Amino acid sequence: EVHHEMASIDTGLSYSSTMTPARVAAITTDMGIHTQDFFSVFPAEAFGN
Amino acid sequence: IVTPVTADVAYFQKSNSPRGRAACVVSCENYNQEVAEGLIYDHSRPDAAY
Amino acid sequence: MDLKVVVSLSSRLYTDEIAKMQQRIGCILPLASTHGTQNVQGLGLGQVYSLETVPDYVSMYNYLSDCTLAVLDEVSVDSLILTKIVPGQTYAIKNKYQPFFQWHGTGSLSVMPPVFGREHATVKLESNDVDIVFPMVLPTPIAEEVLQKILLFNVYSRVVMQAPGNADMLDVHMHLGSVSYLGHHYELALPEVPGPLGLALLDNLSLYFCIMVTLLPRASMRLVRGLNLFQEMVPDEIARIDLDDLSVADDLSRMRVMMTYLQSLASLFNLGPRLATAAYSQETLTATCWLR
Amino acid sequence: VDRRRLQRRIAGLLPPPARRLNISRGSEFTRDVRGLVEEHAQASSLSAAAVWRAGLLAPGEVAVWSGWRPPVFGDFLIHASSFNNAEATGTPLFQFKQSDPFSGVDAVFTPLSLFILMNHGRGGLTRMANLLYDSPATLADLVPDFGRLVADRRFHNFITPVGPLVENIKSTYLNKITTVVHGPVVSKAIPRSTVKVTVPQEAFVDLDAWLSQPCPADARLYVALTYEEAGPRFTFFQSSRGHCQIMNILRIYYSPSIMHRYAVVQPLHIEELTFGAVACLGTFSATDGWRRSAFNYRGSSLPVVEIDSFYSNVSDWEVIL
């Protein structure tokens, strides 16, 4: 194994770097209609019969 | 291709497949046929479009 | 320090013999002697697990706990360069065995002689008349489970061959063909017809278990009479004790052979050479084990 | 076959490490006593002459036989929730065997963390047990069915010790511990420091002191999961015996609790007959062993026994009855 160590420390007071979202590439989800069923999230619960 | 009278118009207004489901046959895992016919003919599951 | 054992071959192999050995380049097998050059007649589990003799797990287990073990390294046309294991350092073995039991990291690997059919763990060589039987390497919970279940399968096949109204084949197969560990469910290759009068693997062990637990209620009452009330509290029907009609010589012989069969069966229920894995990587099927 | 080729090769093969040296005076510090006392380390800075001088490229064992084997590691990926990162570097771990077939993330257990499994399925240990692991349900779900496993008394063949930790690199979600599963527990760090096995004091009994002739060289560390009537307890045992003697000593040790378990509940079922299990974790020197100290977290400090120069050797579970 090749082990290495580095020590970095902020020399300014406020935020000295910024990161903005520039361009959307793709909405990688589909904004669909799919609810998570509670028989899988709360599986041990059932009714009286 | 004979379909029933109560197919919704919004399916026929978008780029779809002419049958009932779409075919997500590229999307399933490679070199497999049972999961492909799951993603083609299995109507215990719904097509993920609608 | 070297570890190479170069067993050479008398008549060089055919192409399919190399092709069948080359797929088993990671399995382990016993050696005859730990000498720096051997010949193929001494190799792993052949001279006891042969066709003409009756095969027995007791002698195979004693041979496996007797001699050294060795993973093999390469298969050439005329040689089988292989490295013996020593308990000093650790080795890279692979789960390339025909009943495929998926291992797990930090698993205790038992090496028992093969009970899944001779034909599954063999390389029947036609060049030299030798049948290299590789031993079946499986993790110890699966090992003790399959041992209990094939002991029970042998006694349940013998009890249905002695009488039909006792055990059923829908009873002794769904219960005993199923080995479950860590969610992995396994199916077993069992002899539906073992054939009577012994003559098959794991027969005498079932017979050893039968005579041991037959003579054991005669021994428990002798011990609680020699040694008590808490030990007479737990059994009820065995408390009907008749220690005064049997001769002391015959009772002594029965007690001695009971102790001997109990000991041999107990030492066999420890699975002999037990490797201990560290980090089983099933991406490359390679476990890291040492002799423990 | 030529002799001059074999002679120079066996002259590399033959000469051993110096097993003795007759010292003339113990203050010269000559080349010979330097050659006896120099040991090759397992770490070097990355250069050419650095690895050529520390000798990382020698096969088998590092040199520029002696019973010094490198240990075999076990690297385990766990959540950050089951392992308090401020726990000590030397603590013995317990990996649970999960019923999920392709898991990839397992469940490890410090004996500090293993206390609340016993005590929330229903002194100084309980305070630090609830302090170091604040929510008992984040461990009561890693074991999926603790109540059924304690009900059928199959809880010791599901738990395998992996020895003590050596390095716990702190990540935010999925944490990577590395333990030494077999061998000499030394630190994997660039300032190489000695690592001691920090076992809690109340979970420990010294069995040599419980009896209170021959003085051996190395003693073994035993753990003992036992099924009481009040739930399980993970008691540690230190002894200098073999397994086959210390199981009889443990039968003597828990012979009151055997009659007590028979007196509190009749084992009408088959599985209620078994009682407890012991397994060794490894060996250490019996003379300078098990010095006591304390462990500092924020809200308390429980006593902690430290065992140094450990040789990890995990053994299998042996029923006591």
Tab-separated table of C-alpha atoms in Angstrom, chain C residues 1 87-90 102 104-108 140-141 145 181-184 230 233-234 274 276-279 282 288 290-292, chain D residues 13 69 72-76 95 97-102 154 157-158 160-162 181-182 258-259 262 266 273 313-316:
chain	number	residue	atom	x	y	z
C	1	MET	CA	12.288	-21.759	2.253
C	87	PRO	CA	0.830	-23.473	9.292
C	88	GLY	CA	3.519	-20.775	9.059
C	89	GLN	CA	2.046	-18.650	6.274
C	90	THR	CA	-1.255	-18.151	4.465
C	102	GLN	CA	-20.629	-19.743	-1.841
C	104	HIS	CA	-17.952	-15.854	3.035
C	105	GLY	CA	-15.057	-13.857	4.434
C	106	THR	CA	-13.907	-14.940	7.904
C	107	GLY	CA	-15.341	-18.385	7.324
C	108	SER	CA	-13.992	-21.557	8.851
C	140	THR	CA	-17.780	-25.642	8.665
C	141	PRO	CA	-21.474	-24.774	9.391
C	145	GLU	CA	-25.104	-29.557	8.600
C	181	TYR	CA	-26.903	-21.066	5.577
C	182	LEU	CA	-26.818	-17.234	5.440
C	183	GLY	CA	-29.848	-17.143	3.167
C	184	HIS	CA	-28.112	-19.323	0.596
C	230	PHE	CA	-30.498	-33.800	39.287
C	233	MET	CA	-34.501	-35.832	37.482
C	234	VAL	CA	-34.183	-35.128	33.748
C	274	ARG	CA	-9.856	-26.813	9.225
C	276	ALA	CA	-9.604	-20.299	8.403
C	277	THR	CA	-10.343	-17.694	5.750
C	278	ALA	CA	-9.918	-13.943	6.046
C	279	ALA	CA	-11.413	-12.036	3.095
C	282	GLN	CA	-16.168	-13.801	-4.918
C	288	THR	CA	-7.160	-16.149	1.775
C	290	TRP	CA	-4.044	-20.416	6.506
C	291	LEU	CA	-3.735	-23.660	8.413
C	292	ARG	CA	-5.638	-23.437	11.687
D	13	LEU	CA	20.942	-20.365	0.998
D	69	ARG	CA	5.063	-13.273	10.453
D	72	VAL	CA	-3.385	-10.994	7.926
D	73	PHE	CA	-5.870	-8.139	7.938
D	74	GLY	CA	-9.614	-8.106	7.784
D	75	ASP	CA	-11.015	-4.948	6.194
D	76	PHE	CA	-14.691	-4.442	6.914
D	95	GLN	CA	-18.809	-9.546	13.248
D	97	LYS	CA	-23.202	-13.155	10.277
D	98	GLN	CA	-26.015	-11.489	8.368
D	99	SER	CA	-28.833	-13.456	6.744
D	100	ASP	CA	-28.643	-11.218	3.657
D	101	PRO	CA	-26.856	-13.308	0.983
D	102	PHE	CA	-24.947	-10.601	-0.909
D	154	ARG	CA	-28.132	-20.166	18.184
D	157	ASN	CA	-22.514	-19.806	15.872
D	158	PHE	CA	-23.785	-16.615	14.236
D	160	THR	CA	-17.532	-14.735	14.768
D	161	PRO	CA	-14.727	-12.786	16.453
D	162	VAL	CA	-12.399	-11.045	14.032
D	181	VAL	CA	-7.875	-11.419	12.197
D	182	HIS	CA	-4.772	-13.563	12.770
D	258	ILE	CA	-26.485	-24.252	35.237
D	259	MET	CA	-28.527	-25.222	38.296
D	262	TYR	CA	-32.679	-25.310	35.520
D	266	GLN	CA	-37.490	-26.255	32.900
D	273	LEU	CA	-30.525	-27.401	27.042
D	313	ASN	CA	-5.530	-16.302	16.834
D	314	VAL	CA	-9.288	-16.661	16.649
D	315	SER	CA	-10.692	-20.046	17.632
D	316	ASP	CA	-14.088	-21.587	17.114
